[PDB]
Write a protein that binds this DNA or RNA. Structure first.
Length: 75
DNA sequence: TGAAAAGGTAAAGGAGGTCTTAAGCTCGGCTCAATTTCTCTCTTTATCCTGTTAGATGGTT
């Protein structure tokens, strides 16, 4: 959602501002405090911002190394 | 008529099942703290929608 894009942009801007102010890469807790949000929310945003990798990425393709969901004939 | 030859009867004894207690256990109920669901409120976000007035006007690899 658009609000998520705006949240990610604000997180990037805050991180750059803290890096400029403190002269070093900010930690997760520092960013979470500055954003006034829990660290778990920040990690959730970071995980949801990822781009999906295509199944045909060379490793040979990625799609030939992923098992299938089901009950093993043995089970 | 005498005599096998089988068929009964009354015991003794054993074999087997069925009853009785002293010892011990463990099992459920009862109480009674000590708590996890539930169901309302009561918020609080999560998601979508609309608008923005200097001027700008044909692609990169």
């Amino acid at each position: 959602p658009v609000h998520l894009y705006e949240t990610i942009s604000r997180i990037k801007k805050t991180t750059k501002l803290l890096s400029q102010e403190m002269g070093r890469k900010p930690t997760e807790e520092e960013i979470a405090t500055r954003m006034e949000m829990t660290i778990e929310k920040l990690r959730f945003i970071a995980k949801s911002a990822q781009l999906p990798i295509s199944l045909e990425t060379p490793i040979s393709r990625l799609g030939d190394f992923i098992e299938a969901d089901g009950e093993t004939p043995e089970d």
